[PDB]
């Protein structure tokens with residue numbers, strides 16, 4: 001197989017400054033900050049994840065795994081890793097996505113989100129995923145929470161916590177134990193712990209559903225442990241109010257039991273692409289026409305990661 005010649009950049013801790021906390025939990029702490037490479041007269045808005053405060057050899061292993069994947073991907077619809085910093089704790093440094101995750105975004109902006117935006121996100125997520133598929137990579141955790149918003153017009157896939165690189169000989173991926181997001185995964189993933197690109201397509205379907213319902217919890221109520229039987233019955237997520245049958249049919253096709261029957265990311269690009277040419281024909285949102293969506297501080301040597309190569 002092809003040698004992976006990605007560069008892993010190591011960053012001095014003096015080169016960046018953590019300006020405010022963004023979040024906290026099982027993963028650690030994510031800060032927003034600025035990265036100023038030395039003598040370069042450029043200032044790059046970044047997100048920085050350090051591991052809580054601890055050093056668990058089974059956790060350091062996991063952030064370094066994530067670094068590995070992120071360093072191996074270069075695409076406008078996939079999040080960019082800027083580098084790692086090897087201090088007390090291993091720090092992951094990425095491009096700041098100022099509008100946060102897309103689940104939270106649609107929740108907060110339902111009244112302002114038009115069909116053009118929804119369909120575009122669909123194209124963009126599909127484009128990222130298709131790229132990942134080209135790079136033989138299975139994401140395994142696609143959800144609206146794991147898509148970040150750089151601008152309302154521009155989203156990127158994140159969270160390579162669970163991503164696995166398939167061998168040129170490998171067709172699926174057998175996983176082990178592990179906590180998993182049940183409501184987003186294909187039937188095979190629940191029954192056999194098989195994961196393919198086509199299992200990601202299923203997750204893509206659920207992600208589209210999240211967007212179209214402005215951020216509903218899939219199978220709200222239904223406890224995790226009985227989802228497998230529900231799906232084998234033939235039951236699926238309901239048609240969201242705003243969705244034409246044309247759109248809902250794409251979601252449904254992502255949720256076929258036979259994985260080869262599901263759409264390919266490349267196809268999804270085409271389909272949504274066509275729909276985003278005439279959005280009002282495909283999504284019915286009241287007040288669609290009169291809907292608009294949206295500089296920080298300090299100095300003006302500021303350059304987005306996308307323009308720092």
Ligand SMILES: *CCC(=O)Nc1cc(Nc2ncc(C(=O)OC(C)C)c(-c3cn(C)c4ccccc34)n2)c(OC)cc1N(C)CCN(C)C
Nearest residue numbers: 022023030047048049092094095096097098099100101104
């Ligand atoms: C959905 C929650 C969220 O993401 N909230 C959020 C996010 C961000 N921006 C941002 N930019 C980059 C990254 C990122 O790639 O971080 C890597 C891991 C270094 C993240 C981010 C990634 N994870 C896993 C997070 C968990 C929690 C918080 C952030 C991240 N996030 C901003 O930047 C302005 C704000 C933001 N807000 C404050 C939370 C949403 N509330 C408004 C509801």
